[PDB]
Amino acid sequence: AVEQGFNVKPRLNYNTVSGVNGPLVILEKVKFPRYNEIVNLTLPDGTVRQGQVLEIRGDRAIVQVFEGTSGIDVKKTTVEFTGESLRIPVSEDMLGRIFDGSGRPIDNGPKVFAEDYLDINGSPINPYARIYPEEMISTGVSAIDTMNSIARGQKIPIFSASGLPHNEIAAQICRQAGLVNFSIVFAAMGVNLETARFFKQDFEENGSLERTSLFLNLANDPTIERIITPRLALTTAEYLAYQTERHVLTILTDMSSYADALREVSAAREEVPGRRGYPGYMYTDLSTIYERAGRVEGRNGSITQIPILTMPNDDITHPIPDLTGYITEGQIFVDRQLHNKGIYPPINVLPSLSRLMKSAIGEGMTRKDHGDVSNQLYAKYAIGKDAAAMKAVVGEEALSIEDKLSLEFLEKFEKTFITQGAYEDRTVFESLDQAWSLLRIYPKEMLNRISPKILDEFY
Amino acid sequence: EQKNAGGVGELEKKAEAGVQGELAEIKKIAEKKKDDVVKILIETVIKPSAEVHINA
Amino acid sequence: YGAIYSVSGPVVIAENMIGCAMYELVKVGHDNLVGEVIRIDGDKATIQVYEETAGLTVGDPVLRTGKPLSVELGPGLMETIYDGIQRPLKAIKEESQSIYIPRGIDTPALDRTIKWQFTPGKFQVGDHISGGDIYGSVFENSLISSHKILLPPRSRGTITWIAPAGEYTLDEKILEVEFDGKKSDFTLYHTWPVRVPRPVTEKLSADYPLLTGQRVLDALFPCVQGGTTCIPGAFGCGKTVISQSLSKYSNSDAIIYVGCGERGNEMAEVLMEFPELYTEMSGTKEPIMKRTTLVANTSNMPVAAREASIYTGITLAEYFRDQGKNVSMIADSSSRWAEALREISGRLGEMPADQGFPAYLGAKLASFYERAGKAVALGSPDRTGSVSIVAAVSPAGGDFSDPVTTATLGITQVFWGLDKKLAQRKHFPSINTSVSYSKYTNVLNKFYDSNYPEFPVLRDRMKEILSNAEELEQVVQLVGKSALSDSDKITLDVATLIKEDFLQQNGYSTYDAFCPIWKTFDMMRAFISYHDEAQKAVANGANWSKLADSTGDVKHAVSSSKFFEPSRGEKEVHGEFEKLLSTMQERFAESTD
Amino acid sequence: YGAIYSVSGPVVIAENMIGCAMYELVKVGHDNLVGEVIRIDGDKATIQVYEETAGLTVGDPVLRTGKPLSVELGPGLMETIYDGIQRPLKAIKEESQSIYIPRGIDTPALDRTIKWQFTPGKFQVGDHISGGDIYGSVFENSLISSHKILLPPRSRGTITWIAPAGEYTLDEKILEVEFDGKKSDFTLYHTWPVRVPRPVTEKLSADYPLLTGQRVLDALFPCVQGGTTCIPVISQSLSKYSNSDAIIYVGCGERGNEMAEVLMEFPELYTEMSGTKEPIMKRTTLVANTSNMPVAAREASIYTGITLAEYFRDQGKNVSMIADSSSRWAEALREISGRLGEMPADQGFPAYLGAKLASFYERAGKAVALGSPDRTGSVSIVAAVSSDPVTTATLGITQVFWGLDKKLAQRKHFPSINTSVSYSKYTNVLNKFYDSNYPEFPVLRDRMKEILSNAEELEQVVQLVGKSALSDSDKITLDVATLIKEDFLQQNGYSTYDAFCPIWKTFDMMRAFISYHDEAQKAVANGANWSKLADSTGDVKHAVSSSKFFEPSRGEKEVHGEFEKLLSTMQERFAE
Ligand SMILES: Nc1ncnc2c1ncn2[C@@H]1O[C@H](COP(=O)(O)OP(=O)(O)O)[C@@H](O)[C@H]1O
C-alpha cells in the first residue's frame, strides 16, 4: 500500500547574505550547501520569498529568487534552507483549480490538500518504457488534422509570431481535441492578462474548467518563476497522466518568455552565452521541459504537449524556435503573411511539420488516402508558392499551365481549406473530402505524388 | 436570458444541497480520526531524532 | 550613512553600506543627489544616480532613506510638469531663480502652500475603511473637480477622526485611522512606490474605444480605453505628433504625458499649446492643461532618470484610474527607456542580451505595459477607471527589428506602425496600413453595434480596398498598368483617393486637427459608397475612362469632404454628408443614364 | 576519497582530489553518480556528471575509479538497448520494475547471468598470445553464429591456462595469461576506453560498396564498406538488407518519441538474409540517448557506438554504424565548452570541433584486425546532420555527402537528396568493383550526372525566359531529366516494390533511362520533331516510368531479362 513518513527536519536560518544582484542572492557561509535546494528568504518587511540554489562553492550558495530580489537587505534578510528540491503537492483534486506561477492558488480555494510531494524536475523516463504514440487526435483544425496530424503523446508546438492568433488556435485545439475527455494543464508564462482571461473564458465556456488546472504566471508576475511554471505544470501533467491513468493535454504558452527568463537568470550568472545571448545549456533546459511528453508502457496515459511559442520577428533561425524544433516533434507554423491576408487559422503548412503523421496518418487508422492526400497537398502548395513568385517576378503570362493550375489551387486552398471559422469542428474525413475537392482541380495525370491505387479509387 | 437568470438561484440551492452531505462526511471523518492523527503528530513532534549531517 | 567608493557615469558603488535594500532610495553625494540601489556586494551597494554625477568625490556621504522610490499622489498633480524624479519644474525654477535644473534640488513633490476645499465623503466616524476607499473630494480645478481623496491602498482600519469640510493644506491631517490600537494619521497626499503597481479590485475587458480623433487610427486600428499601444517608426514619422494629438483631443478624462527621453522644445510646445486649447467635456470650455500632467525627462537630462520618469508617469496614471478616471498615459520615446537601461547595464558590466540591451528588458517592458487596463478601483464606492498606454517605441535606424520594438510588440495589443516613406511625402500620420494592426477590433463590436452599426463593415471593406490596391500597385510597378481591368483601375483610383484624402489627416490645421468618430464614419461611408457605386457603374457597362471625366465633380466633392470643420456640430456635418451622398448618387445616375 | 567543492549543473568541482587524471571516471556523491574528470587544476578536478546532479551537497565524497570512460566489450551486446554510456535500458527496467531510470544505477553493462557456449580457439596452453588474438569463439544467436571473443588489445603473454569448451558466464575466467612475469586472468568480456580507438594491424582501402538500397545514393553517390556518409528511411534500409554483418545504431539528442519509434520498429522488423526470417535485433545494438538525458551522456553516446562498431569489426565482421543526429553531439560539445568556460570559435562551437569530428570519423574504414588469425572488418559510418559549423567541419573529413535538398523536400519528393551539392569520393575507388561486376555502371552514372547537370543549367534560363523556343535537343534533355527525377531518383521507401532497389536493378534502370535519352537524341538528329516523337514514344516513356515497379523478389536473372525486353522494345519502337 501507500508509504509515507511523519518526519520533522529542522531548517537552518542564514542571516549571512553576502550580496544580491539581479535575480541572484549570494550567501556567505552556508553549512554543507545543497545544490538545487529550495530556500525561503524572509525579507525585512516580513514577506517570505522562495528561492532555488543554482550554484554552490565551499561555503557560498548563489540563490535565485523566484519572486524577485526587490527589497532584499543584505543585513536583515534571513535565508531558510529547507532541505529538498522544489516539490509540488499534487492531488487528484488539483483538477479544476487555478494556481499562480509559483504553484500557489489564485482562486479563493484553499491550499491543495497534498496527495504526494512530486519533485518538479521529474525523473527521466526509460526510453524502453516509452510507447510510440500511434493514436491520432482529431484536433478539428483542417490544416493540422489533414496535413500536420498530431498523435496522442506528441510534443508539437505552435510557432507563432507576436500578435498572431496562436491563443485562438490553441484554444480551438483544446476545445475540439478528441480522437479520430482530455484533461488539460495550462502554464501561462508572462502572457498578458487579456490572453490569460481569454484562455480561462474559453476553458469555462467549453466546460473544460471542471477538468483543467491552470498555472497562470502573468506579465505582472515576477520574471524568474517562469522557470518553475513549466516544471510545475508538467509535473502535474505527469502525475495525472501516469499515476491516475488519465489523458492530459498540456499547453505551455510563451516558451519564448520562458527562454527570456532563462536568459535573464543566465546573464546574471555571467555564464558563457550561446547565440543571441541565451545560455549554452538552453537546449538541455528546453529538452527537460519538452521531453516530458509521450505515453508509457505500463500506465495508460498521455501528455500531448502543445507549447505555444512566440518566435520573435517571425523567424525560425532564432534560438528559441530553433531548439524547440530540435527537441519537439515538428511544429505548427503560424504565418504573419497569411494572417494579414485574413486566413484563420493562419497556419503555413510549408514550415509546418508533424513527425508522427507518418505513423498516425491512415491505412486503417483514419483513412486509406490520408497520407497521399497530405503529401499531394503539401507538394502542390509548394508548387503554388513557386508559381506565385514566378508570376510576380516575370509576369503571370509566362507561367505554364501547371503553374496556373497551382495558383488556382493555392487560392482555393488558402481561401477554402485552411480558412475555417473558430468553433468549427470538421472531422478528418470532412477535411480529406475538402482536400479532394481541391485536388480534383488538377487532372489525374498531374497528381503524381498520389499512389495510383488510391488515385483511381478516390478521383 | 431572463428564464436562465431565474434558474441560477434554484441551481445554486440544488448545488448547495448536494454538497451538504460531503461536508457531513468530512466532519464525521475528522471526528473519527482526530484522536489518531493528533497522537501521531504529537509523538512525531516530540521525541526528536539527533543525527549529524551525513557528510560531516 | 555610507560613503562613495567608486563613480563611473551614473553608477556610484558606495562602501560601508551594510543594511541597504534593493531598489532602496539613497541620497548620494553632498548635494543629496537622488539615487537607487540596484546591486549589493557585501558592504558596497551599487547606486544609480538620477542626477548629474559629475563632481562627485570618493568619501561623499550617501544617506539611506529607508524607502523605495516613492511618488507623492494627491491634489496638485494636475496642470503641472515634473522631472524624472517627482520634482515640479516650475517650483525648481522659482526656487533656483535660474533656467537650469540644479543638482540635488529637493522641492516638495506637491505644492504644500495651496489650500484645497476638502468635502468629506460618505464615510463617518467609526466606520471601517479599507484600502482605496474615498473619504473626501478636493476641488482641484474647474475640470478635474472632485479630486476624490483615496485612502492609501495598504492602509486599513476604522476611522477615529475625519476632518470637517473646509480648506486644508497637504500637510494638514484629514483623517486618522485606528488599526489594532495603533492610530495612523492620514493627509490629503500619500506616497507610493513607483515600481509596485497600485492594487485594483479586478481588471476588466476594455470595451470602449479611445477615440484618438485621427481618421486612420480610430477607423482602421482602434485603441480601447485600457489597451496597450505602440507606435514604432523612425525619426520624423510622427510618433510625437500622434501622441500630442491624442493627449489633446482624446476622450480620456485625465492624461499623464511622459516625455521619457524626448526633446525639450516638445515639452515647451505642450506647455504653451495645451492652455490654448479647450475640451468640450465637463459641460464647459475648460482648458486642456487643467487635465494633463507632464513628466519631462528630456534626452540630455540624466540617463538613469528616464526609468524614474516612466514609472512616475504610470503611477500617476494608476492613481487617477483608482480615482475613477479614464486615464491615458503617453510614454513618449519609450525606446529611450530601453537605451537608459542599456547604458546602466553597460556601466554595471552585466552580460548583454540581443543588441546591447540587458537580458531583463523584455520583462521590465512587459511589467510596465501590464499596468494598463480598465479595472474596478480598490474600495467603496464602486469605481471603474482605466489606463491606456500609448508609448512611442523609437527603433534604432528605422527598422522594426529593434529589440525594444519586438519586446513591445509581444505585449502591446495595438501596433500603429509608422512608415518613414509615407512620412517623407508629408502623408501624415503616415500609419503603415500594411503592417499596423489592432487586436481590439473584435472587442469593439459591442460598441460599434450600439453606435455607428456599419462602422466595422466599412472598416473591413476599406482594409480590403487598400490591400487589393497595394498588391495591384506592387504588380503594376514592374508589369505596367496596361493589363489592368476597369475594376482594377477603379480600385487603384479609389485607394489613391482614400490614402490622399481620408487616411491622411493634416494636423495643425483648422479643419482636420480633430476628425471625431461621427465625421470619420460619415467620410468613411462616403468613400466606400463612391467605390461601390463606381464599380456598379462600370459593371453596368459604362467605361471608366469616360466615367472619370463625368464624375470628377463627385470625386472632388468626396475628397473635399475632409474640409468640413467638425466644430459645425454633429447634426450639421452629418447633414452635409447626407447631401454629398445624395449628390454623388444623382451624379452617377446621370452619368450612367 | 575526493570531496565535492562546488556544484553548478553538470560540472562538479571536487576538492582533495590529488592524483587524479583527465577523462577519468569518478563516482560522484553518495548515490555513486558516474562522472568524468574534465579539468584538474591543483587539488580541484572539475567533473561532469552523467546523471541528474540535483541534490549533490558540498562534502559528498567522490572516488576515483582509475579508468577512462570504458565500454564493456563482450558477448551480449546484440539485441540490447543501451543508454549513452552503455547502461542496459532493458536490464534497468527489469531490475527497477519502474518506468524511470533510478539515479546512480549500477547495473552491469553486460548480462552476468546468461551462460554462453564457449569453444576454445586454435590457441593452446603454452602458446604465446598477442594483443587482439582470438582465443575462442562463443555462440550468441542466429545471426552472430560465432562471436569470436578477442583478447584485450595491449595485453600479451604466454597463456598458462585456457578454459575447456562448455557453458560460461561473463564473471568466470576463461583464459589466464602469464604476461611479463605477472599472472593475469581474462574473461569473455573486456573493457576498452571509448576515447582511445581500438588498434588495427593496418587500415585498408575500402573497395566494396555499401548497398544503401536507395537508387539515388547507390547509383550516383555510392558508399563503400568502411566509408563515411554524412546523411541528412535509409536507417532501416541499411539496417535490414545492406549485407552488413552487424550494425550499431546510435542516437544523440533523439526526440523521445523518435527513439521510442526506433525501439518499437527494430525488434519488429525482420531480415531474411539467413536461411529464414530472423530479427534485426539479433544483428544490431542500439545506443539510444534522447535529448532528456544528460549532455555528458549525449556527448559520450557517439563514442560508445563507434567503439562498439570497432569491436565488431575487430571480430572481422563488416559492421555499419548509423549515428543519428551528429549535430546534437556537436551541440553537446558546445554546451560542455560553455559549462567549462572555454572560449568558443566560429558559431559558438568549441574550437576543437574539427578535431573531435575527425577523431570520430577516422575510426571508420576497412582494417585488418590485429592478431592472428588474419581477418578484415569495416566500420561504415553513417552520421546524420541537420552552412552550419558542424557540417562545414564535417565536409572536410567525410568522403561522402548526401545533402538534403529543401526544394525537393518541399515537393514531397523522397529521397530529397540534392544532386548538385552531394558527392561521393569513392566513385574512383569503386571502379575496381564496377568494372568487375557491372562494367557499364560508371559511364552511365556519369551520363545521368551530366544530364541532370545540363537540366539544372537549363532550368534557370527556362524560369527566367518562359522557355517557349527551346531547341529540340534541349527539350529532349530536359524532358528526360524530369522523367529521371520523377521515376529513377524518386523512391517510395515504404512501398513494397521500391523498398530496397538492388544494385543490378538500379543498373538496369540506368540503362533504360540512358537508352531512352540516346534514342530521343538520335530521333531529334534524324530531323523528326520532338513534339511528334512525344506521342510516338509515349508507350516507351510509360514503360520506362513503370520499370520502377519491377519487384526485386523476381530474381536477378528474371528481372534483368524483363529489362532486356524493355530495351529491346525501345530499339524496335525507334522506327516511329
Ligand atoms: N498628423 C500630422 N499632421 C501634421 N503634421 C505632422 C503630423 N504628424 C507629424 N507631423 C510633422 O512631423 C513633425 C514632428 O514629427 P514627430 O512626431 O516629432 O516625429 P519624431 O517623434 O519621430 O521626431 C512636425 O514638424 C510636424 O509638422
Q: What are the cell numbers at C391?
A: 508609448
Q: Do residues A450 and A435 touch, judged by C-beta distance below 8 A?
A: no
Report the relative pairing of strands C254-262 and C326-331 from DSSP bridges.
parallel
User: Taking the C-alpha atoms of A414, A416, A421 and A426 in order, what is their torsion angle to the nearest 10 degrees?
Assistant: -120
Burial track C308-341 (b if 16+ CB lie within 10 A, e otherwise): bbbbbbbbbbbbbbbbbbbbbbbbbbbbbbbbbb
Cell for D523? 530521333
Residues 434-473 of C with CB under 8 A from A: 434-435, 437, 439, 467
* Residues 6 or more apart whose Cβ sits within 8 Å of residue A272: A280, D337, D338, D339, D341, D344
Instruction: Measure the CA–CA gap between D305 and C223, rounded to whole angstroms.
Output: 60
Could you give the CA distance from residue A254 to residue A311 in angstroms, rounded to a whole number?
A: 9
Nearest of C458, C448, C449, C355 to residue C403 by alpha carbon:
C355
**Which secondary-structure segment (H or E) carries D81?**
strand D81-82
The full DSSP string for C83-121 is: -SSS-BHHHHHHHHTSSS--TT----SS-SSS-EEEEE-
Distance CA C131, CA D550 (A): 85
The torsion region of residue C373 among left (phi > 0), alpha (psi -120 to 50) and beta comes to left
Is the four-CA dihedral A318, A323, A328, A330 of positive or negative sign? Answer: positive
Written as one letter, the residue type at C373 is G
Instruction: Provide the 3-class DSSP secondary structure of residue C201.
Output: coil
Q: What is the 3-state secondary structure (H, E, C) of chain A?
A: CCCCCCCCCCCEEECCEEEEECCEEEECCCCCCECCCCEEEECCCCCEEEEEEEEECCCCEEEEECCCCCCCECCCCEEEECCCCCEEEECHHHCCCEECCCCCECCCCCCCCCCEEEECCCCCECHHHEECCCCEEECCCHHHHCCCCEECCCCCCEEECCCCCHHHHHHHHHHCCEECCCEEEEEEECCCHHHHHHHHHHHHHCCHHHHEEEEEECCCCCCCHHHCHHHHHHHHHHHHHHHCCCEEEEECCCHHHHHHHHHHHHHHCCCCECHHHCECCHHHHHHHHHCCCCEECCCCCEEEECCEEECHHHCCCCHHHHHHHHHCCCEEEECHHHHHHCCCCCECCCCCECCCHHHHCCCCCCCCCHHHHHHHHHHHHHHHHHHHHHHHHHCCCCCCHHHHHHHHHHHHHHHHHHCCCCCCCCCHHHHHHHHHHHHCCCCHHHCCCCCHHHHHHHC
Q: Which three cell numbers stand for residue A273?
A: 552565452
Q: Where are the beta strands (DSSP E) in D144-227?
A: 147-150, 157-162, 166-168, 175-177, 184-186, 190-193, 202-203, 209-210, 223-224
For D325-364, where are the E strands, in sequence order? Answer: none
Q: Which atom of ligand 1 is nearest to the CA of C508?
A: 4
Distances D126 to A452, D148, D160 between C-alpha atoms, Å:
70, 20, 6
Pairing of strands A247-251, A302-305: parallel
Helices (H), C371-419: 403-409
Q: Of A146, A141, A139, which is closest to residue A367 (Cα–Cα)?
A: A146
Q: What is the largest CA-CA distance in chain D?
A: 91
Q: What is the DSSP letter of D20?
A: -
The DSSP bridge partners found for residue A258 are none
Separation of alpha carbons C50 and C31, rounded Å = 12
Contact C554, C583 (CB under 8 A): yes
d(CA D403, CA A113): 56
User: In angstroms, rounded to a whole number, what is the distance separating the alpha carbons of residues D19 and B25?
Assistant: 67
Residue type at position D233: V
Question: Cell numbers at residue D107, please?
Answer: 547495473
- Asked if residues C327 and C385 have their Cβ atoms less than 8 Å apart, the reply is yes
Cα separation, A267 vs A258, whole angstroms? 14
Q: Is the CB of C238 under 6 A from ligand 1?
A: yes
Neighbours of chain C (3+ CB pairs under 8 A): A
The answer to whether C436 and C223 have CB atoms below 8 angstroms apart is no
Which residues from A are below 8 Å from D253, CB to CB? 283, 287, 326-327
Tell me the angle at which helices A229-243 and A255-268 cross, rounded to the nearest 10 degrees. 130
CB within 8 Å of C364: residues ≥ 6 apart: C341
C-alpha closest to that of A446 among A363, A374, A379: A379
Do A265 and A273 meet the contact criterion of CB atoms below 8 Å apart?
Answer: no
Whole-angstrom distance, CA of residue D149 vs CA of residue D371: 12
- Verify whether ligand 1 is closer than 6 Å to residue C355 (CB atom): no
Q: Does the beta-carbon distance from D348 to A378 stay under 8 Å? A: no
Q: Which residues pair with D314 in a beta bridge?
A: none
D473/D37 Cα distance (integer angstroms): 66
* Residue A251 near residue A136, CB atoms below 8 Å: no
Residues in chain D: 576
Give the separation between CA D379 and CA A277, rounded to whole angstroms: 40
d(CA A159, CA D568): 55
Q: What is the resolution of this structure in A?
A: 3.5
- Which SS3 state, helix, strand or coil, does residue C263 take? coil
> Nearest CA of chain C to the CA of A220: how many Å?
5
Ligand 1 neighbour C235 (Cβ under 6 A): yes
Alpha helices by DSSP H, C352-454: 361-369, 403-409, 420-424, 445-448
Q: What is the amino acid identity at position D452? A: L
Nearest CA among D565, D569, D562 for reference residue D537: D569
Q: How far apart are CA D352 and CA D195, in angstroms?
A: 15
Q: How far apart are CA B24 and CA C51, in angstroms?
A: 66
Contact call for B41 and A6, based on CB within 8 A: yes
State the Cα torsion A179-A184-A190-A191 to the nearest 10°: 60
For D510, the enclosing helix (H) or strand (E) is helix D503-525
Nearest CA to ligand 1 atom 2: C507
- Give CA–CA dist C306/C581, Å, rounded: 51
Tell me how far apart the alpha carbons of residues D429 and A160 are, in angstroms, rounded to a whole number.
Answer: 50
Q: Whose CA is nearest to atom 4 of ligand 1?
A: C507
DSSP H/E element including B26: helix B2-45
Report the C-alpha gap between C328 and C248 in whole angstroms.
11
CA C279 – CA C248 distance, rounded (Å): 8
Under a CB-based contact definition with an 8 Å cutoff, are residues C198 and C184 in contact?
A: no
Task: Tell me the helices (H) and strands (E) count for chain C, helix number first.
Answer: 16, 28
Cβ within 8 Å of D, B 16-55: 53-55
Cα D62–D36–D79 angle (5° rounding)?
115
Contact C20 A74 (CB under 8 A): yes
C428 lines ligand 1 (CB under 6 A): yes
Return the amino acid letter for C129. I
Q: Are strands A98-99 and A212-217 parallel, antiparallel or unpaired?
A: parallel
Q: State the CB neighbour count (10 A cutoff) for residue D568.
A: 10
- Report the distance separating Cα D510 and Cα D441, nearest Å: 8
Residue D368: beta bridge partners?
A: D202, D376
Helices C305-322 and C361-369 cross at an angle (nearest 10°) of 20
Torsion over CA of A254, A259, A265 and A271, rounded to 10 degrees? 180
Confirm if D138 and D118 have CB atoms less than 8 A apart.
yes
Ligand 1 in contact with C505 (CB < 6 A)?
yes
Which stretches of C10-163 are assigned E, i.e. beta strand?
Answer: 12-15, 24-28, 33-41, 44-49, 61-68, 70-73, 81-82, 116-120, 128-129, 134-138, 147-150, 157-162
Query: Cα–Cα distance between C300 and C315 in angstroms, integer?
Result: 23
Residue C142 phi/psi, 5-degree rounding, is -70, -20
**CA D445/CA D439 separation, integer angstroms:** 11
Ligand 1 centroid to residue C506 C-alpha, Å: 10
Angle separating helix axes A193-205 and A166-175, nearest 10 degrees: 20
Q: How many angstroms does the Cα of residue C145 sit away from the middle of ligand 1?
A: 33
- The region, left, alpha or beta by phi > 0 then psi within -120 to 50, assigned to residue A308 is beta
Residue C204 amino acid letter: L
Please, are residues C334 and C344 in contact by the beta-carbon 8 Å criterion?
Answer: no
Give residue for cell 496527495: A115
Element at C246 (helix H, strand E): helix C239-249
Indicate the DSSP class of residue D52.
Answer: -
Position C82, amino acid:
Y
Q: C368 C-alpha to center of ligand 1: Å?
A: 26
Which of A161, A141, A155 lies closest to A334, judged by CA?
A161
The tally of CA atoms less than 13 A away on the side-chain side of residue A449 is: 24
**What's the Cα-to-Cα distance from D367 to each of A459, C451, D313, D315, D322, rounded to whole Å?**
56, 86, 8, 11, 19
What is the distance between the alpha carbons of residues D349 and A354, in angstroms, rounded to a whole number?
Answer: 29
What is the residue type of C549?
A: D
Using alpha carbons, select from A175, A218, A224, A177 the residue that is nearest to residue A195. Answer: A218
Q: Are C308 and C194 in contact (CB under 8 A)?
A: yes
Q: Distance between CA atoms of C348 and A248, rounded to whole angstroms?
A: 45
| Residue C429, preceding peptide bond in cis (omega within 30° of 0) | yes
Question: Within 10 Å of residue C352's Cβ, how many Cβ atoms?
Answer: 17
Sign of CA dihedral D510, D514, D516, D519: negative
Measured distance CA(C293)–CA(C83) in Å, rounded: 11
Which residues does chain A have within 8 Å of residue C42's beta carbon, measured at their own beta carbons? 18-19, 74
Residue C142 CA: distances (Å) to CA of C182, C255, C274, C322: 38, 16, 15, 20
- Taking the CB of residue B43, how many other CB atoms lie within 10 A of it? 10
Is residue D69 within 8 A of residue D195, CB to CB? The reply is yes
Specify the pairing of strand D184-186 against strand D134-138. Answer: unpaired
A4 contact B CB<8A: no
**Per-residue DSSP letter, D34:** E
Q: Are D366 and D206 in contact (CB under 8 A)?
A: yes
Q: How far does the CA of residue B55 sit from the closest CA of chain D (Å)?
A: 5
- Indicate the residue type of C552: G
**Which residues are paired to A98 by β-bridges?**
A214
Residue C43 to residue C46: CA distance in whole angstroms: 10
Residues forming a β-bridge with D170? none
Which amino acid is it at D569?
A: T
Interface size between B and D, measured as CB pairs under 8 A: 9
Residues with Cβ within 8 Å of C520's Cβ and at least 6 positions away in sequence, in order, are C215, C218, C219
Closest-lying ligand 1 atom to the alpha carbon of residue C234? 22
Grid cell of C4 as nine digits: 562613495
Cα C449 from Cα D357, distance rounded (Å): 67
| Atom from ligand 1 closest to the CA of residue C332 | 21
| Residue type at D473 in one-letter notation | S
How far apart CA C3 and CA C10 sit, in angstroms, is: 16
Which of C212, C215, C241 most suits a substitution to test ligand 1, by most atoms within 8 Å of the C-beta? C241
Query: For residues D463 and D468, what is the distance between their CA atoms, to the nearest angstrom?
Result: 11
Three-state SS at D349: strand
Report CA-CA distances (Å) from A424 to A139, A169, A206, A209, A345: 11, 12, 13, 21, 11
Q: DSSP labels for C333-359?
A: THHHHHHHHHHHHHHHTPPB-GGG-BT
Residue type, C101: I
